[PDB]
Structure 1
Amino acid sequence: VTADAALEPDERAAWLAYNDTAEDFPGPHLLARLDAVAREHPDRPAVHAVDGVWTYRELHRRADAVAAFLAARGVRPGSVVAIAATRALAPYAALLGVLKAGCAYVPVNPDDPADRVAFVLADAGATPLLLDTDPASLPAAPAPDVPHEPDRVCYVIYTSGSTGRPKGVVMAERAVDNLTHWVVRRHDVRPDDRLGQTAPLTFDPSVQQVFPAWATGACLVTVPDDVQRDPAAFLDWLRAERVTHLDLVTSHWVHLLNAAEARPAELPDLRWIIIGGETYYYHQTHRWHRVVSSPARLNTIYGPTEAAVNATEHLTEPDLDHGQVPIGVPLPNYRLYALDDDGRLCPPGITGEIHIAGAGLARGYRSAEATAKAFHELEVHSGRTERLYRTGDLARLVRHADRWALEFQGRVDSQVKISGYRVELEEVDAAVKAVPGVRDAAVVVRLVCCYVGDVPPDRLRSRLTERLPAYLVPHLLVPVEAL
């Protein structure tokens, strides 16, 4: 009957202890806390972008203007509004002003190919009003009278794992509030802190930096694109900007480790890197704490976008030098289960598919089919029927120090990741094959491309950036005669 039916008491007890995660957080809802910070700290810097710094007063003023504009053009609460994700100031007033309108923002990269932007507008139900006009130069205005309704939708963020099947994750306020409380409390975020935003706003780790900043009075510091590509300049930039909290995907951090081994760094202001996405190992994290002088602790996380950025966490020990780092214990009010093909809860030590429950779950996808294939109800213990999200990820429950912990084990469809983004090998093969003049193409991750045909690698470069996002156009494009 139940998913734990076959377990012995000791094995069922391990799972019960692991998911003993309930925590009640105080204060009003998320947006209200953001407004209280604007009242308490109007003169503090709230966002530091590439074209300037905005105080909390200016940020909420500009956001107010955005929300009044949206009301003036018939955008009622519960609508979805696109915002141009850039590294400038404008997008922050856009996304905040959308939220004050009682709406949800869908982040769009304006450099992305137009065909993919059109899909996202259509699938999100999103108006492009704020893509067509400059959100920061809208006429000043008070915010409109939007009542507070509980668990409103905050964002639709797109995950592009399946080719021709981008999925729009719909995320509501309780999940984002719960995440924000965790980030602030777990990492001791304070008004004087400076939170780096490495992820663009199209990638949900930006969420984990922006709202904990704005819910505390800390400063959100967006990491400029030219700085992120150069691991050396990035390390210098973290010191010059006195960043206290940073987000990275595992592969990006490995680059920083390489750049740190070549030129060891002092980062006295850094207290936290929240890092995750791919499996990594204690011999790497030991190497890091060797060439980096810093109080920064590494917080390894795991989580799909479908469960509000992060679902598990592990404080990474700097003494250990061997073995795989575990993804750790669930975030507050999260609950995770390792299930087999049959839906039975795996004994400790046995690899299963992660299903996620609790306060972090999306409402679902915009697509009904995708929602029905991934969210489901299961009675996992006697008397506990969970709404679950089926991740596609494998993990086992292990003993790590005094605690039960999950250890990541792979995927069921094991696709590759590039700069933290799940992508299929077969989409970049079809994209270069579809360039008229090119023929066969093989793409390997070393992202390198070998293709047959007489399109010089410059004209191919130009045709690919018009078709693919900037992160899927291969780093090398080598013309070859046969495969």
Structure 2
Amino acid sequence: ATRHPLAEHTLTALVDAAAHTHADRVALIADGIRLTYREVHDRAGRLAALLAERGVAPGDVVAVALPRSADLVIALLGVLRAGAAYLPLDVDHPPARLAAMVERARAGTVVTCQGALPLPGTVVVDDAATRDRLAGLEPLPTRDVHPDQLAYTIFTSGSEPKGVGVAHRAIANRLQWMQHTYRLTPEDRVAQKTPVGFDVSVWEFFWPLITGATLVVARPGGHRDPAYLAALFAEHKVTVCHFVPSLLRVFLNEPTARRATALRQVIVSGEALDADLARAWARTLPQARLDNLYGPTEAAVDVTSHPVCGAGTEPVRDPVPIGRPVWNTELYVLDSSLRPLPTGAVGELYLGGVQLARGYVGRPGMTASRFVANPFGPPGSRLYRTGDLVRRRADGAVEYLGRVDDQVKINGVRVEP
């Protein structure tokens, strides 16, 4: 019973509302400088105008290949402003992989910069002629966006990688739920440290920017260096961040992690969270609450959450639950005959509700095999089969137990052997 009204149904509406309300606040701390909401949105509007004059229209997919920087943030916002979905390309991946993603997603435009240049429709934002054109365009008024148009297409490993298309409506639900639950204020500082190809980065970019809070952008590669992260967090009094379980362990093994005393909420997702790691977190940073979130890329970043560390939490023990569904989301634990299991029995987690992705771009057969008809929901609805073995506890919280298949995680990255 997670039904909940949504104030807005698109990410562009949420970002635009914040840009008006918080115009003269700092939006970004990045690259050694500070940009206000007004400045970030003026630059994103110029880029949207340039994209539109190059043929980008609502419904299109625009690839983005920029290192973590202010220009990356502006690019994502500019793509959305133009009515298009963004396809993030991690400039670390090899060229052949990036080219195949652009082809499968039918991205006709690639936004990049000179450093990360070495594909059809390349826009090089720091080319002299392009800088001059951006300065000579009026910021574009946000296009009208239908909630079922895509906001982003993110590739995951494929047993050929699959491109998951996630609609505006799905990510609007996910981000408004997050803000209701953890309540960023304009004084908050969330760190941008997750690679842009992992869908956790979607809320790092956009949650602070729909609330008036400040995004603190780590340098490219800095997510690999825990002493650098602890230094960045102390310097800018970062209050909210994410870790994957294996990199949380690396962070807590760093002597200066205890200097991140401004942290008030950390989100952990992507792999199973062990109880000894949660206990170690609470010994190192007692004032920082810790929540375990779970979900596949196919259902808009996370579908469940559980409070693990902080006032009011239960004593931690293994398995640490993945918790209870977010807004407008349903969880079913099914057997191999597609029947619901009684409480406590192990079966496979199936997901329903507003956050399901449209499907895998260009792959109807694969889509229909994993986003399947829903016996339980309204007529015509679908379920996503996760491949995760779970059980529901007496009190209703769900526990992750393992995989039905051979899928693995490296450092939070989904890898299909």
- Name the TM-score, length of structure 1 as normaliser: 0.78
Counterpart among 262, 284, 294 of residue 291 in structure 1: 284
Identical amino acids, percent of aligned pairs: 41
2:282–2:288 contact (8 Å) kept in structure 1: no
1:85–1:200 contact (8 Å) kept in structure 2: no
Greater mean deviation of Cα atoms: 325-334 or 238-247: 238-247
Counterpart among 373, 378, 387 of residue 374 in structure 2: 378
1:90–1:134 contact (8 Å) kept in structure 2: no
> Partners in 1 of 2:109 and 2:306 — Cα distance?
40
Counterpart among 22, 30, 43 of residue 62 in structure 1: 43
Counterpart among 326, 331, 337 of residue 331 in structure 1: 326
Deviations 1:104-142 (A, max 9, x none): 010012232111011111011102342333336352322
> Partners in 1 of 2:190 and 2:308 — Cα distance?
20
Q: How far apart are 1:417 and its partner, in Å?
A: 0.9
User: Structure 1 residues 352 and 331, CA, compared in 2 at 3 Å: closer, same or farther?
Assistant: same
**Residue 249 of structure 2 corresponds to residue 254 of structure 1:** yes
Counterpart among 227, 230, 249 of residue 232 in structure 1: 227
**Residue 395 of structure 2 corresponds to residue 395 of structure 1:** no
User: Structure 1 residues 370 and 57, CA, compared in 2 at 3 Å: closer, same or farther?
Assistant: same
* Structure 2 SS opposite 1:408: strand
> Partners in 1 of 2:410 and 2:213 — Cα distance?
30
* Structure 2 SS opposite 1:133: strand
2:11–2:151 contact (8 Å) kept in structure 1: no
Aligned residue in 2 for 1:455 = none
Residues 265-344 of structure 1: matches in 2 within 5 Å? 265-293=258-286, 295-317=287-309, 320-344=315-339
User: Structure 1 residues 386 and 77, CA, compared in 2 at 3 Å: closer, same or farther?
Assistant: closer
User: Structure 1 residues 245 and 145, CA, compared in 2 at 3 Å: closer, same or farther?
Assistant: closer
- Name the TM-score, length of structure 2 as normaliser: 0.90
Residue identity opposite 1:160 in structure 2: S
Greater mean deviation of Cα atoms: 348-357 or 410-419: 410-419
> Partners in 1 of 2:262 and 2:398 — Cα distance?
31
* Structure 2 SS opposite 1:126: coil
2:308–2:316 contact (8 Å) kept in structure 1: no
Q: How far apart are 1:358 and its partner, in Å?
A: 0.5
> Partners in 2 of 1:257 and 1:206 — Cα distance?
21
1:375–1:387 contact (8 Å) kept in structure 2: yes
Give structure 1 stretches of 5+ with no counterpart: 1-19, 426-483
**Residue 101 of structure 2 corresponds to residue 112 of structure 1:** no
Residues 354-433 of structure 1: matches in 2 within 5 Å? 354-366=349-361, 367-380=363-376, 386-399=381-394, 403-425=395-417
* Structure 2 SS opposite 1:199: coil
Equivalent pairs, count = 397
Q: How far apart are 1:210 and its partner, in Å?
A: 1.6
Q: How far apart are 1:33 and its partner, in Å?
A: 2.8
1:336–1:357 contact (8 Å) kept in structure 2: yes
Aligned residue in 2 for 1:474 = none
2:155–2:164 contact (8 Å) kept in structure 1: yes
The alignment yields a C-alpha RMSD, in angstroms, of 2.0
2:86–2:153 contact (8 Å) kept in structure 1: yes
Q: How far apart are 1:28 and its partner, in Å?
A: 6.8
Counterpart among 207, 230, 234 of residue 202 in structure 2: 207
User: Structure 1 residues 108 and 268, CA, compared in 2 at 3 Å: closer, same or farther?
Assistant: same
Say which one has the larger Rg.
Answer: 1
Aligned residue in 2 for 1:158 = 155
Counterpart among 53, 63, 70 of residue 89 in structure 1: 70
